[PDB]
Amino acid sequence: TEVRVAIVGVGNCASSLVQGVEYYYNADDTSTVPGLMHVRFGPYHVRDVKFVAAFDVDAKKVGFDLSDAIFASENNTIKIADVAPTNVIVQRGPTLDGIGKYYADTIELSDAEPVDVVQALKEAKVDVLVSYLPVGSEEADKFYAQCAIDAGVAFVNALPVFIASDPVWAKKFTDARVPIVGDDIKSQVGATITHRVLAKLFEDRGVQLDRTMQLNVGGNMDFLNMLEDVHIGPSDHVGWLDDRKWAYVRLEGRAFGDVPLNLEYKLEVWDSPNSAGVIIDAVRAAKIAKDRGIGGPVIPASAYLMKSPPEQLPDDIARAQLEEFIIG
Amino acid sequence: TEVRVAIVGVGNCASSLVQGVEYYYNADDTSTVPGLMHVRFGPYHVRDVKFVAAFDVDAKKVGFDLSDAIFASENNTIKIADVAPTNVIVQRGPTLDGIGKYYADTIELSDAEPVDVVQALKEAKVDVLVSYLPVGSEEADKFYAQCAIDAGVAFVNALPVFIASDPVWAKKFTDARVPIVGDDIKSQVGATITHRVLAKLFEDRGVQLDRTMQLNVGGNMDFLNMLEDVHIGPSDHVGWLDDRKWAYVRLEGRAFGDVPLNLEYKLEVWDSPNSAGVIIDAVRAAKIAKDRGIGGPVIPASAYLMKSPPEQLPDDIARAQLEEFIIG
Amino acid sequence: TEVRVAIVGVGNCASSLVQGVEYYYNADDTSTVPGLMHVRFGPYHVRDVKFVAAFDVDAKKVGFDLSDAIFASENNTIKIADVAPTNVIVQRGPTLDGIGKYYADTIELSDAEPVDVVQALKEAKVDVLVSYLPVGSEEADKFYAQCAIDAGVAFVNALPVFIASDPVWAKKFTDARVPIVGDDIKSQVGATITHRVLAKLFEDRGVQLDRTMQLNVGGNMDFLNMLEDVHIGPSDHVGWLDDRKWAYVRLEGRAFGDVPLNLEYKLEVWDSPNSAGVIIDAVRAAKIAKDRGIGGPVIPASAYLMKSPPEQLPDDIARAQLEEFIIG
Amino acid sequence: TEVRVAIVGVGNCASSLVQGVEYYYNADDTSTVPGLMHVRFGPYHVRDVKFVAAFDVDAKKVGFDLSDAIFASENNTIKIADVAPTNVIVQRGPTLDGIGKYYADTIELSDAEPVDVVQALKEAKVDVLVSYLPVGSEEADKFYAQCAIDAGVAFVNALPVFIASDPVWAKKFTDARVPIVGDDIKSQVGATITHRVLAKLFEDRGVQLDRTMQLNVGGNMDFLNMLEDVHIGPSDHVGWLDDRKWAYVRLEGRAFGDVPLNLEYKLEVWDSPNSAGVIIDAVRAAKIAKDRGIGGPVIPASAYLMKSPPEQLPDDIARAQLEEFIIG
Ligand SMILES: NC(=O)c1ccc[n+]([C@@H]2O[C@H](COP(=O)([O-])OP(=O)(O)OC[C@H]3O[C@@H](n4cnc5c(N)ncnc54)[C@H](O)[C@@H]3O)[C@@H](O)[C@H]2O)c1
Ligand SMILES: NC(=O)c1ccc[n+]([C@@H]2O[C@H](COP(=O)([O-])OP(=O)(O)OC[C@H]3O[C@@H](n4cnc5c(N)ncnc54)[C@H](O)[C@@H]3O)[C@@H](O)[C@H]2O)c1
Ligand SMILES: NC(=O)c1ccc[n+]([C@@H]2O[C@H](COP(=O)([O-])OP(=O)(O)OC[C@H]3O[C@@H](n4cnc5c(N)ncnc54)[C@H](O)[C@@H]3O)[C@@H](O)[C@H]2O)c1
Ligand SMILES: NC(=O)c1ccc[n+]([C@@H]2O[C@H](COP(=O)([O-])OP(=O)(O)OC[C@H]3O[C@@H](n4cnc5c(N)ncnc54)[C@H](O)[C@@H]3O)[C@@H](O)[C@H]2O)c1
Ligand SMILES: C[As](C)(=O)[O-]
Ligand SMILES: C[As](C)(=O)[O-]
Ligand SMILES: C[As](C)(=O)[O-]
Ligand SMILES: C[As](C)(=O)[O-]
Ligand SMILES: [Zn+2]
Ligand SMILES: [Zn+2]
Ligand SMILES: [Zn+2]
Ligand SMILES: [Zn+2]
């Protein structure tokens, strides 16, 4: 009944995921938990999620037990639960394009030789591989995706590298009978969706949005890495913010009579945990597809849990389709 | 082709309405204007809206031309258009419960004797009477509603006094074959709808809203009059704000792992003009119902343009039903 | 070496004071603590402050040990330290005008008969009586001030009732050789001083401040009680804020060329603790004056620690004069 | 009685300066104007400031009348006054290091051959040269400073290139009997001074400032150019902001009992005009020093009007010393 999970990139998101499973390890499956569609997704309780392997390139992570690696190097997300030794030692994966200038100047790459990822996946009997590679790691993400396909392991693509949403890659998974949920994991409530909802509000109520500004500040490596009319994008890295992300947004519009109507807000979130619940749902959905031997992109799951899914669908419809998929 | 309009309560809302018609008097009916469903609602262009009568109780308004009365006494909304003399002299209506302690201490009641409103409506051949009485004026609003019924004049109830939404009053209008659109005119984008949309966002995304605060400040008589877990309501009267209304709102919730997620915002609007467009649509809808000899609450119009309609309907559905009503 | 303290009004401020002494009971006198001029003020270490008596009128406080009374009824300030039983039982003081409509509707007055305060003070051998009566309690504050004079007990007036700053009362204390520090205890950083500093900034830099607004919200009885161009004052009571006080302030000015220059801010503080340190310094200053047999207002202490002192003096000068007073 | 002024760098600051003189051309010298120490500084009325020459490198400015050049290319500050043709044609200055990558990719350099600046200054009989070179233009600013010295023209250094504050350069001006006021012109109320005052407030009131963040956004070339614990610095370029600069700042501290005390604010200013008044005072001070034949840094003026003066002095003292200098 377990879901054997392997993690690529033991960063802040990996930390929120491992801690998250620990946090809700004893949750009642008849109750509702924030950030999770179901404490028990299909047959899988959160506790059924077992971490059996992990890959990284940082000297302070490779060779260390997963339980330590999640709190090492630049990892700095909020600690919600203690994580006992897992006995899972982080292995050396191929760096490829996963480490940009800012990262390289911040960490030291492990001296260990990159292992044979496909063999590593098979030896660990992994069911689902979750990829947390830094933004821009196209070669690296596609490399890991390929290993997953070759090892017959389901893939959950958490970063904005088009794989599940690239017909070419969708076909590779389909033909191999390997499931994939992916291309940019969603956050529960982040700046993007908040701005979308409000912009829609203006529009639906007849208020013309003339100008908009979105300033984002954070203090983690994901933010640092991304640093490397309408305005939007990472603004400034603020060390003491750690894994938190603050969004300062201003909407300026005109209502009846061209009368000015403004709205300014600040959204405060802990970035990584904002997606841990979503990932946990993705992981189990990918597991279910695998139990059924259905390869290719898991359509309902990707539409509801990812920002760049194979096929676009309204959230509620995507949600309903995902609920049907679960029941099977 | 004209819509003969009479105004009860020449305050800030009345000012935005009269100025609004002037502002869009030459608008192209194939274009879209903020705050208006249609420049030409059915057969009625904004310009077809003619002000033929008005009633008030303030010594600085009664006896004055409507064009002056809208800028008199405590009226202080934003001026978007010059208004030439209308030759419509503001008449003395019965005060009843339209003037509370705060208002009474602020203005001087007109020495003139209250006129016979029913006769006044008939003599002016009014088609639609729009009521802008202060909040709490139940006896006064029902009195004016009654006059409207007796004169065979359609009624648009802009304040939170239940008439269209009170089965008893709905029946009175129905039986008299007089249309009524009403009970609290909507604003395009105000604090209420903004908070609703965001609260829904949290809920839909699995974020538990634990605490919420909504502080409102303004500088007009409507605000002054209203001054006479969850928190909400008029907070403080700020003189120099005039007709503007600022809402400071904070939402505190918990996302996956009980991680704190907050959102704080400030909405800046010019309160009265925020409903002028809505009123203009209500007025013409009421006119159309009258042209058809259909009495009682105009269901589609009230559902879409009012906060407390006879029957609740999702905005988009109410909107679609209103579009069908227009075509007839 | 102890400073025998009695408290009038066991509310939020009393709670922050008692907890405060506990919190810094073991502080190093060569270190600096936020909110305190000296861990050891003259000969008195914070720990030398002993609570020996207290008076209230609330049924949930009178008859209870001080350690419980500080956390009873509507008290809701932040808890910074555990407070062990003190064996000091809260006595029934005369209500007089200390309980307004809002308070009366919130609490139940103790059935106990008001005691003879003068006798109570003498029996407890009190050195300093600190008054935390609600705003507006003039008769009550002057009554307690009188008892203090009669018992030869130094008085620290924390509320805005003019006593130390009223020549008539200043003379009563002087003639009795009883010290008094008083009339509205200062906060370290509150809305008032923050606005003062910024308004001064504008002025000194040649920016004309045209309009200003200050909105305050809180969730304690002090705030509730106070609820009973320029804008300023208590705006709205927000239950879940508890003892916290949030100030939303906006300054609008004109710089060179009449160019608009604005500044908007939000100050978040825990109201009661914001003055506990100040009170602790006041208490010891009053003790020192008593050791010297010097009656009347302690000038340096009042100028630096109170909002409405007998004599106004620039903070730094008042501070320097207070430092000289300490050395003696 | 005129002050012959030449401008190096016809950007936003140059625009605010030229418009500023026009705006207050008819000001009463017995009145006080925001941003100016005196409408009449010594013998010089604002109107005595005459623009007689200007230098730039942009193809859309060189060869154009100053009155047009101030509103050309990327200039986008607020327009406070119409500026009639001046008959002063912008000349081609040597680019040197005044145009970085971001600027070069934004504008096209003039095809004209750089002129002999020293000769140009002499031919125009310039009294004061104001330098508005972009940040980082060390070689260019020192080149222009040298020309000024050689032409016997007073220099006002508005950018952060150390000249007046570099003993070596201070001596060059002194030995040549040429005055210099300089190194980074002050703003009336900008983010820096606002943060300074508040940080000082915390400190003086016993509140320990633990963390601070300062985010700045703007929409002009100065901001774009600058883009090329504690946090501070240019955060993000927001096109539609134009010459406006918004500073989002948050201060987090601990008050008595280690209780959290926070302050968050947003300062909205029009960046360039925020220094026009200061420059006008600097220009006349430099003129007075020249009338007296006193070379080297004008100490009082630099201490009060510049961020990096030769010698540091408290603002009020520097202000008083400057007032004495004026009287002479
Ligand atoms: N945190 C969120 O809410 C959220 C939401 C959507 C998308 N994402 C994306 O998910 C990713 C995860 O971010 P974090 O989790 O915030 O990032 P992170 O920077 O903390 O960690 C990335 C990890 O990958 C490791 N890594 C780098 N190259 C590697 C390679 N070749 N092989 C194996 N490991 C390698 C790094 O050493 C590091 O431990 C980012 O791309 C982010 O943009 C995050
Ligand atoms: N402004 C908005 O966006 C908006 C939205 C929804 C509802 N409303 C409601 O609409 C009403 C109109 O507010 P304003 O228009 O903002 O208010 P207002 O205070 O400016 O004007 C009300 C007017 O009614 C007059 N009046 C009082 N008693 C009267 C009587 N017996 N007979 C005739 N006239 C009388 C007053 O003298 C005054 O001119 C308020 O009740 C308000 O709450 C306004
Ligand atoms: N908290 C601050 O930072 C601050 C700063 C300056 C001034 N003050 C003033 O100090 C006072 C203390 O406020 P809290 O401490 O915040 O107020 P509070 O409302 O929490 O407590 C006042 C207490 O006085 C008791 N009381 C009322 N009448 C009494 C009487 N006749 N005899 C004895 N006790 C009586 C009440 O039952 C209550 O326990 C207020 O007047 C407040 O405005 C507070
Ligand atoms: N605006 C303020 O409040 C303020 C306050 C302090 C300091 N400053 C500094 O003053 C300077 C002026 O900024 P703006 O005025 O905002 O900048 P800007 O970018 O608008 O204009 C600089 C001008 O210099 C011209 N220039 C560039 N290289 C040149 C060269 N070699 N010779 C002649 N002209 C050349 C450019 O083409 C442009 O017109 C900046 O360095 C800024 O940082 C501005
Ligand atoms: C069955 As359930 C509590 O996950 O919706
Ligand atoms: C016909 As139309 C421009 O009002 O939607
Ligand atoms: C002597 As001390 C540390 O209180 O200033
Ligand atoms: C003499 As004056 C009005 O500039 O201070
Ligand atoms: Zn992350
Ligand atoms: Zn209104
Ligand atoms: Zn208090
Ligand atoms: Zn500038």
To one decimal, the resolution in angstroms is: 2.0
User: Residue A154 annotated as binding?
Assistant: no
Contact B197 A194 (CB under 8 A): no
Are C225 and C311 members of one domain? no
| CA distances (Å), origin A184, targets A135, A171, D306 | 10, 19, 49
SS3 content of chain B, % helix, strand, coil (to 5): 35, 25, 40
CA distance linking residue C223 with residue D232, whole number of Å: 36
Q: Which residues of B are annotated as a binding site for NAD(+)?
A: 65, 124, 144, 187, 222
- Whose C-alpha lies nearest to ligand 6, atom 4? B38
Are B211 and B114 members of one domain? no
What tokens were used for B60?
């600085």
Greatest distance between any 2 Cα atoms in chain B: 69
SS3 content of chain A, % helix, strand, coil (to 5): 35, 25, 40
CA distance linking residue C52 with residue C123, whole number of Å: 10
Nearest to D77 by CA among D22, D132, D19: D19
B152 CA: distance to closest CA in chain C (Å): 45
SS3 B65: strand
Are D79 and D226 members of one domain? no
Are A196 and A263 members of one domain? yes
CA distance linking residue D24 with residue D39, whole number of Å: 8
Domain boundary among D272, D291, D311: D272
Contact B263 A194 (CB under 8 A): yes
Are B43 and B174 members of one domain? yes
For C217, the closest of B211, B215, B240 (CB atoms) is B215
Domain boundary among A230, A248, A272: A272
Q: Which residue of A has its CA nearest to D264?
A: A266
H/E/C letters for each residue in A129-180? EEECCCCCCHHHHHHHHHHHHHHCCEEEECCCCCCCCCHHHHHHHHHHCCEE
Q: Which of C13, C64, C110 for mutating ligand 3's site (highest number of atoms within 8 Å of CB)?
A: C13
Q: Which of D28, D29, D319 for mutating ligand 8's site (highest number of atoms within 8 Å of CB)?
A: D29
Residue A201: CATH number of its domain: 3.30.360.10
CA distance linking residue C308 with residue B147, whole number of Å: 59
Check if the beta carbon of residue B77 is closer than 8 Å to that of residue B55.
Answer: no
Contact B215 C213 (CB under 8 A): no
Residue A304: CATH number of its domain: 3.40.50.720
Domain boundary among D225, D255, D272: D272
Q: Count the domains in chain B.
A: 2
CA distance linking residue C273 with residue C304, whole number of Å: 18
- Residue pairs spanning A and D at CB distance below 8 A: 42
CA distance linking residue A271 with residue A158, whole number of Å: 13
Method by which the model was determined: X-ray
CA distance linking residue B234 with residue D97, whole number of Å: 57
Nearest to B33 by CA among B249, B246, B320, B281: B281
HSE of C283, CA atoms in CB hemisphere, 13 A: 35
D131 lines ligand 4 (CB under 6 A): no
Are C4 and C92 members of one domain? yes
Identify residue B94 by its one-letter amino acid code.
P
Q: Identify residues after which chain C is interrupted (C–N over 2.5 A).
A: 228
SS3 C263: strand
Check if the beta carbon of residue C247 is closer than 8 Å to that of residue C231.
Answer: no
Q: Nearest 5°: phi and psi at B217?
A: -135, 145
Quick one: which H or E segment has residue C53?
strand C49-56
Check if the beta carbon of residue B324 is closer than 8 Å to that of residue B303.
Answer: no
**Which residue pairs from B238-241 have beta carbons closer than 8 angstroms and sit at least 24 positions apart in sequence?**
B238/C213, B238/C215, B238/C231, B239/C229, B239/C231, B240/C211, B240/C213, B240/C229, B240/C231, B241/B217, B241/C213
B234 CA: distance to closest CA in chain A (Å): 19
CA distance linking residue C62 with residue B160, whole number of Å: 46
Are C281 and C321 members of one domain? yes
Contacts of B292 (CB under 8 A, 6+ apart): B328
Nearest to B183 by CA among B11, B314, B309: B309
- Whose C-alpha lies nearest to ligand 7, atom 4? C38
How many angstroms separate the first and last alpha carbons of chain C?
17
Check if the beta carbon of residue B23 is closer than 8 Å to that of residue B81.
Answer: yes
* Nearest atom of ligand 1 to the alpha carbon of A271: 3
Are D80 and D23 members of one domain? yes
Which chain B residues are within 8 Å of C217, Cβ to Cβ? Answer: 213, 215, 235
Residue B289 CB neighbours (<10 A): 25
User: Residue D65 annotated as binding?
Assistant: yes
Nearest to A161 by CA among A43, A294, A272, A9: A9
| CA distances (Å), origin C41, targets B44, B328, C284, D206, D207 | 80, 85, 6, 15, 18
Query: Please, what is the angle between helix D138-151 and helix D167-176, to 10°?
Result: 20
User: Residue D73 annotated as binding?
Assistant: no
Question: Strands, E, within chain B: which ranges?
Answer: 3-8, 40-41, 44-45, 49-56, 91-92, 128-131, 154-157, 179-182, 208-218, 230-231, 234-237, 244-255, 259-270, 296-297
* Number of residues written out for chain D: 328
Contact C258 D36 (CB under 8 A): no
CA B86 distance to own-chain centroid = 22
Residues A210-234 as b/e (b if ≥16 CB within 10 A, e otherwise) read ebbbbbbbbbbbbbbbbeeeebbeb
Quick one: which H or E segment has residue B140?
helix B138-151
CA distance linking residue C307 with residue C162, whole number of Å: 11
What tokens were used for D177?
């009997």
Nearest to C178 by CA among C189, C164, C196, C190: C164
User: Which 8-state DSSP code applies to residue D27?
Assistant: -
Give CA torsion, residues B41, B45, B46, B47, to 10 deg: -160
Radius of gyration (Cα) for chain C, nearest Å? Answer: 20
* Residue D233 structural domain: 189-272
CA distance linking residue C303 with residue C317, whole number of Å: 9
Identify residue B302 by its one-letter amino acid code.
S
CA distance linking residue A61 with residue A119, whole number of Å: 20
Are A59 and A155 members of one domain? yes
Contact A16 B188 (CB under 8 A): no
CA distance linking residue C58 with residue C92, whole number of Å: 8
Are B204 and B123 members of one domain? no
CA distance linking residue A195 with residue B281, whole number of Å: 29
| CA distances (Å), origin C327, targets B265, C288, C289, C321 | 50, 10, 12, 10
Are D241 and D285 members of one domain? no
Nearest to C94 by CA among C63, C139, C151, C152: C139
SS3 A276: helix
Q: Nearest 5°: phi and psi at D22?
A: -65, -45
Identify residue C216 by its one-letter amino acid code.
N
* Alpha helix ranges (H) inside chain C: 12-23, 66-69, 101-104, 117-123, 138-151, 167-176, 191-204, 221-227, 273-291, 299-305, 315-327
Are C87 and C209 members of one domain? no
Residue C15: Cβ-neighbour burial (10 angstroms; 0-12, 13-18, 19+): buried
Ligand at shortest distance from the CA of D161: 4
User: Which 8-state DSSP code applies to residue A302?
Assistant: H
* Nearest atom of ligand 2 to the alpha carbon of B243: 16
Sign of CA dihedral D291, D294, D297, D298: negative
Nearest to B234 by CA among B104, B151, B317, B136: B136
**Which residue pairs from C191-195 have beta carbons closer than 8 angstroms and sit at least 24 positions apart in sequence?**
C191/C216, C191/C245, C191/C247, C191/C249, C191/C267, C192/C307, C193/D201, C193/D205, C194/C247, C194/C249, C194/C265, C194/C267, C194/D198, C194/D201, C194/D263, C195/C249, C195/C251
Contact B193 A208 (CB under 8 A): no
Give CA torsion, residues A167, A168, A174, A179, to 10 deg: -80
What tokens were used for C302?
């009042």
Check if the beta carbon of residue A244 is closer than 8 Å to that of residue A269.
Answer: yes
